[PDB]
Protein backbone atom coordinates (compact mmCIF):
# COMPACT_ATOMS: atom_id res chain seq x y z
CA UNK A 1 0.00 0.00 0.00
CA UNK A 2 2.62 2.56 -1.06
CA UNK A 3 -0.20 4.99 -1.89
CA UNK A 4 -2.44 4.39 1.15
CA UNK A 5 0.52 4.37 3.56
CA UNK A 6 1.86 7.58 2.00
CA UNK A 7 -1.61 9.03 2.63
CA UNK A 8 -1.75 8.16 6.33
CA UNK A 9 1.86 9.24 6.93
CA UNK A 10 1.24 12.59 5.27
CA UNK A 11 -2.03 13.20 7.15
CA UNK A 12 -0.52 12.19 10.51
CA UNK A 13 2.41 14.55 9.87
CA UNK A 14 -0.03 17.38 9.13
CA UNK A 15 -1.97 16.59 12.32
CA UNK A 16 1.30 17.07 14.24
CA UNK A 17 2.70 13.56 14.73
CA UNK A 18 6.41 13.75 15.47
CA UNK A 19 7.15 9.99 15.50
CA UNK A 20 5.49 7.83 12.83
CA UNK A 21 6.24 4.12 12.44
CA UNK A 22 5.34 2.09 9.35
CA UNK A 23 5.01 -1.70 9.37
CA UNK A 24 5.12 -3.74 6.17
CA UNK A 25 6.40 -7.00 4.70
CA UNK A 26 7.81 -5.32 1.56
CA UNK A 27 11.13 -3.55 2.04
CA UNK A 28 10.33 -1.29 -0.92
CA UNK A 29 7.20 -0.05 0.88
CA UNK A 30 9.43 0.69 3.88
CA UNK A 31 11.94 2.32 1.51
CA UNK A 32 9.08 4.52 0.31
CA UNK A 33 8.25 5.23 3.94
CA UNK A 34 11.90 6.11 4.62
CA UNK A 35 12.10 8.51 1.67
CA UNK A 36 8.81 10.03 2.83
CA UNK A 37 10.33 10.71 6.25
CA UNK A 38 8.86 7.87 8.30
CA UNK A 39 10.73 7.68 11.57
CA UNK A 40 10.58 3.97 12.45
CA UNK A 41 10.42 1.09 9.95
CA UNK A 42 8.94 -2.13 11.34
CA UNK A 43 9.96 -5.34 9.58
CA UNK A 44 6.83 -7.49 9.79
CA UNK A 45 10.26 -15.87 7.98
CA UNK A 46 13.52 -15.32 9.86
CA UNK A 47 15.84 -15.35 6.84
CA UNK A 48 13.59 -12.85 5.05
CA UNK A 49 13.45 -10.64 8.15
CA UNK A 50 17.24 -10.64 8.40
CA UNK A 51 17.63 -9.74 4.73
CA UNK A 52 15.19 -6.83 5.11
CA UNK A 53 17.09 -5.48 8.13
CA UNK A 54 20.32 -5.47 6.11
CA UNK A 55 18.62 -3.72 3.17
CA UNK A 56 17.10 -1.00 5.36
CA UNK A 57 20.44 -0.58 7.15
CA UNK A 58 22.28 0.03 3.89
CA UNK A 59 19.56 2.46 2.72
CA UNK A 60 20.38 4.59 5.76
CA UNK A 61 17.34 3.88 7.91
CA UNK A 62 18.18 5.00 11.44
CA UNK A 63 15.46 3.16 13.43
CA UNK A 64 14.69 -0.37 12.25
CA UNK A 65 12.28 -2.37 14.39
CA UNK A 66 11.65 -6.13 14.40
CA UNK A 67 8.75 -7.91 16.11
CA UNK A 68 8.80 -11.47 17.45
CA UNK A 69 7.49 -13.47 20.37
CA UNK A 70 10.84 -15.37 20.34
CA UNK A 71 13.78 -13.58 21.96
CA UNK A 72 16.21 -15.80 20.02
CA UNK A 73 14.94 -14.28 16.78
CA UNK A 74 15.15 -10.80 18.29
CA UNK A 75 18.75 -11.59 19.25
CA UNK A 76 19.55 -12.49 15.63
CA UNK A 77 17.89 -9.26 14.49
CA UNK A 78 19.98 -7.22 16.92
CA UNK A 79 23.24 -8.76 15.66
CA UNK A 80 22.32 -7.87 12.08
CA UNK A 81 21.62 -4.21 12.87
CA UNK A 82 18.06 -3.98 14.16
CA UNK A 83 17.51 -1.03 16.49
CA UNK A 84 14.19 -1.61 18.26
CA UNK A 85 13.27 -5.10 19.44
CA UNK A 86 9.50 -5.56 19.85
CA UNK A 87 8.58 -8.25 22.36
CA UNK A 88 5.13 -9.56 21.50
CA UNK A 89 3.71 -10.14 24.95
CA UNK A 90 0.87 -12.37 26.06
CA UNK A 91 2.16 -13.67 29.42
CA UNK A 92 3.69 -11.26 31.94
CA UNK A 93 6.41 -13.62 33.19
CA UNK A 94 7.61 -14.65 29.72
CA UNK A 95 7.62 -10.99 28.72
CA UNK A 96 9.73 -10.03 31.75
CA UNK A 97 12.23 -12.80 30.96
CA UNK A 98 12.65 -11.68 27.35
CA UNK A 99 13.21 -8.07 28.39
CA UNK A 100 15.93 -9.21 30.81
CA UNK A 101 17.62 -11.36 28.16
CA UNK A 102 17.61 -8.70 25.45
CA UNK A 103 18.90 -5.98 27.76
CA UNK A 104 21.83 -8.18 28.72
CA UNK A 105 22.54 -8.84 25.02
CA UNK A 106 23.02 -5.07 24.71
CA UNK A 107 19.65 -4.00 23.31
CA UNK A 108 19.24 -0.28 23.93
CA UNK A 109 15.64 -0.04 22.63
CA UNK A 110 13.17 -2.70 23.80
CA UNK A 111 9.47 -2.36 22.98
CA UNK A 112 6.65 -4.46 24.44
CA UNK A 113 3.35 -4.90 22.60
CA UNK A 114 0.10 -5.89 24.31
CA UNK A 115 -3.62 -5.18 24.34
CA UNK A 116 -3.54 -5.39 28.18
CA UNK A 117 -2.28 -2.21 29.84
CA UNK A 118 -1.36 -4.25 32.94
CA UNK A 119 1.22 -6.16 30.90
CA UNK A 120 2.49 -2.83 29.59
CA UNK A 121 2.75 -1.48 33.14
CA UNK A 122 4.82 -4.51 34.14
CA UNK A 123 7.10 -3.83 31.17
CA UNK A 124 7.33 -0.17 32.23
CA UNK A 125 8.34 -1.18 35.76
CA UNK A 126 10.96 -3.53 34.26
CA UNK A 127 12.53 -0.77 32.16
CA UNK A 128 10.93 -1.41 28.76
CA UNK A 129 11.58 1.60 26.52
CA UNK A 130 8.48 1.72 24.30
CA UNK A 131 5.01 0.50 25.30
CA UNK A 132 2.88 -0.46 22.28
CA UNK A 133 -0.87 -0.27 22.94
CA UNK A 134 -2.53 -2.73 20.54
CA UNK A 135 -5.84 -0.93 20.15
CA UNK A 136 -9.28 -2.20 19.05
CA UNK A 137 -11.71 0.18 20.81
CA UNK A 138 -11.18 3.94 20.79
CA UNK A 139 -12.33 4.50 24.37
CA UNK A 140 -10.26 1.58 25.67
CA UNK A 141 -7.23 2.94 23.83
CA UNK A 142 -7.71 6.37 25.40
CA UNK A 143 -8.00 5.00 28.92
CA UNK A 144 -4.89 2.83 28.50
CA UNK A 145 -2.81 5.72 27.15
CA UNK A 146 -3.84 7.90 30.10
CA UNK A 147 -3.16 5.15 32.66
CA UNK A 148 0.30 4.41 31.27
CA UNK A 149 1.17 8.12 31.07
CA UNK A 150 0.12 8.76 34.68
CA UNK A 151 2.11 5.67 35.71
CA UNK A 152 5.21 7.32 34.21
CA UNK A 153 5.46 5.93 30.68
CA UNK A 154 7.48 8.28 28.51
CA UNK A 155 7.20 6.51 25.10
CA UNK A 156 3.70 5.19 24.34
CA UNK A 157 2.99 3.85 20.86
CA UNK A 158 -0.46 3.08 19.49
CA UNK A 159 -1.03 0.51 16.74
CA UNK A 160 -4.35 0.18 14.97
CA UNK A 161 -5.85 -0.71 11.62
CA UNK A 162 -8.64 1.75 12.50
CA UNK A 163 -7.64 5.19 11.21
CA UNK A 164 -10.13 6.75 13.65
CA UNK A 165 -8.18 5.29 16.57
CA UNK A 166 -4.81 6.54 15.29
CA UNK A 167 -6.22 10.06 14.93
CA UNK A 168 -7.57 10.04 18.47
CA UNK A 169 -4.35 8.57 19.89
CA UNK A 170 -2.41 11.48 18.43
CA UNK A 171 -4.92 13.97 19.84
CA UNK A 172 -4.58 12.30 23.26
CA UNK A 173 -0.79 12.63 23.26
CA UNK A 174 0.37 9.18 22.12
CA UNK A 175 4.06 9.46 21.29
CA UNK A 176 4.48 7.05 18.37
CA UNK A 177 1.78 6.27 15.82
CA UNK A 178 2.11 2.94 14.00
CA UNK A 179 0.66 2.80 10.45
CA UNK A 180 -0.18 -0.49 8.70
CA UNK A 181 1.18 -0.83 5.19
CL1 LIG B 1 3.91 -3.59 16.62
Structure description:
The protein is α/β, with parallel strands linked by helices and 181 residues long. Helix content is 50%, strand content 21%. It contains eight helices and eight strands. It has an eight-stranded parallel barrel, surrounded by eight helices. The radius of gyration is 15 Å and the shape is globular. The chain binds chloride ion (CL). It is classed as de novo protein. Keywords: de novo protein design, epistasis, stability landscape, TIM barrel, (beta/alfa)8 barrel, DE novo protein. It forms a monomeric assembly. The entry is titled "Crystal structure of DeNovoTIM13, a de novo designed TIM barrel".
List keywords for this structure.
eight-stranded parallel beta barrel; 181 residues; binds chloride ion; 8 strands; de novo protein design; alpha/beta; globular; TIM Barrel; stability landscape; 21% strand; 50% helix; de novo protein; 8 helices; epistasis
